Amino acid sequence: SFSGYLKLTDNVYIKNADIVEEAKKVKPTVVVNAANVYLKHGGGVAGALNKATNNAMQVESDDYIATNGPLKVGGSCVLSGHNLAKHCLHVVGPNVNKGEDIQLLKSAYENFNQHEVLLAPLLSAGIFGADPIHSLRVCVDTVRTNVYLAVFDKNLYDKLVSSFL
Ligand SMILES: NC(=O)N1CCC(C(=O)O)CC1
């Protein structure tokens, strides 16, 4: 199972790790993707997860969008995890750089509660423009299931751990 995580709360764990390498090692039941409403996995965690699937994630996602239309900001869908996990839970956090409402971050994290255990990134962090310290706060105050957070950036990981509470 998961190793090298620092326990933040009873159910939230954190590690300085590349979520792709973590997914390949662990092969969790659920890996969370930091998705957009169109499931266009271009950059950040989405681009990296998609590239690890040899673009199979993007092919599957385009078929999902063709059938269902875009997701809502704050929403999610369960698709295949491909070579990385049993499932990928594509979660759309608000993109602050697109003027999206940061209050939707709690709605985005609520999707994690439908899964007993997940490997995940901080939502709305990185290219989504939100404050990662605030994202971690929303995560611990919203998610009740077991969430293993992979934080790629060491400097951000240290800042998150040292400022937690
Ligand atoms: N979603 C996304 O691309 N990112 C958010 C999480 C960041 C991290 O873990 O240091 C990397 C960038």
From Swiss-Prot:
Residues 1-165 form the Macro domain. Inhibited in vitro by GRL-0617. It catalyses: Thiol-dependent hydrolysis of ester, thioester, amide, peptide and isopeptide bonds formed by the C-terminal Gly of ubiquitin (a 76-residue protein attached to proteins as an intracellular targeting signal). It is found in: Host endoplasmic reticulum membrane. It is a multi-pass membrane protein. Responsible for the cleavages located at the N-terminus of the replicase polyprotein. Participates together with nsp4 in the assembly of virally-induced cytoplasmic double-membrane vesicles necessary for viral replication. Antagonizes innate immune induction of type I interferon by blocking the phosphorylation, dimerization and subsequent nuclear translocation of host IRF3. Also prevents host NF-kappa-B signaling. In addition, PL-PRO possesses a deubiquitinating/deISGylating activity and processes both 'Lys-48'- and 'Lys-63'-linked polyubiquitin chains from cellular substrates. May form homohexamers. Interacts with N protein. This is Papain-like protease nsp3. The gene is rep. The chain holds residues 1027 to 1191 of 7096 of the full protein.
